[PDB]
Write a protein that binds this ligand. Structure first.
Ligand SMILES: Cn1cc(C2CCN(C(=O)C3CCCCC3)CC2)c2cc(NC(=O)c3cc(C#N)ccn3)ccc21
Length: 231
């Protein structure tokens, strides 16, 4: 490994992200003025918890499909064994979705893009998950204050996936090497772009894991009762 390799890694991660980012940031930004009316919000608040679960499931499986397309474009990732790829995605794909959410979050009015328009947390009322919804909003809010560039999101979410602390990895050392190369690529790119100051503002160690845990615990509860997810 060396610095020209590290530069090509940055270019390459950031390219995979652009190809798998789901919606272009500029599309998400321009859609900010498209907000659910009070009548639309009400129509959402009236759905059963089951219908909202269906809609959130569909929303998430579609976000996860881009994250899997992202991983599969990653340099080091396809060279990892079949088991390690599965262990990393199972543990990290939802964490990556939680990070990616900040692009579709508008801090000025605390709304998120969901099914074609922006709406506030109250849109999700019928779920009966207001503690967890409001943690997810807070997490998005605090990432949103960093004003992440696409390439920064690209590198940070790559680091979210390639984490050698996942239990059940068989080639731990190989995942370690790719993790440390990504961490170094991230630092390097921050220096190139005079953005070192964001390292201190990243979510503390374990805030993401624990939020994702609580998120998935709740999905598993809806799933055991209305199994809408397949595989
Ligand atoms: C903060 N926050 C919360 C939400 C939704 C997620 C689903 N929910 C659940 O899974 C649970 C919540 C708890 C219990 C089960 C259901 C309910 C709450 C959300 C969506 C977005 N939107 C995009 O990322 C987005 C990005 C793209 C792109 N590119 C395209 C479309 N949307 C942004 C911020 C968000």
């Amino acid at each position: 490994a060396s610095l020209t390799e590290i530069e090509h890694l940055v270019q390459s991660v950031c390219k995979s992200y652009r190809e798998t980012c789901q919606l272009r940031l500029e599309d998400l930004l321009r859609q900010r003025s498209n907000i659910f009316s009070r009548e639309e919000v009400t129509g959402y608040q009236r759905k059963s918890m089951w219908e909202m679960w269906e809609r959130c499931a569909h929303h998430l499986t579609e976000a996860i499909q881009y994250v899997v397309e992202f991983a599969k474009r990653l340099s080091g990732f396809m060279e990892l064994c079949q088991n390690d790829q599965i262990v990393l995605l199972k543990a990290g794909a939802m964490e990556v979705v939680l990070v990616r959410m900040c692009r579709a979050y508008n801090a000025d009015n605390r709304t998120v893009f969901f099914e074609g328009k922006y709406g506030g947390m109250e849109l999700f009322r019928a779920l009966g998950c207001s503690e967890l919804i409001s943690s997810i909003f807070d997490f998005s809010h605090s990432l949103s204050a960093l004003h992440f560039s696409e390439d920064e999101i690209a590198l940070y979410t790559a680091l979210v996936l390639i984490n050698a602390h996942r239990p059940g990895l068989q080639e731990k050392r190989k995942v370690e090497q790719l993790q440390y190369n990504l961490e170094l690529a991230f630092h390097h790119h921050l220096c190139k772009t005079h953005r070192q100051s964001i390292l201190a503002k990243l979510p503390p160690k374990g805030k993401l894991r624990s939020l994702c845990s609580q998120h998935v615990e709740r999905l598993q509860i809806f799933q055991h009762l209305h199994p809408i997810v397949v595989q």
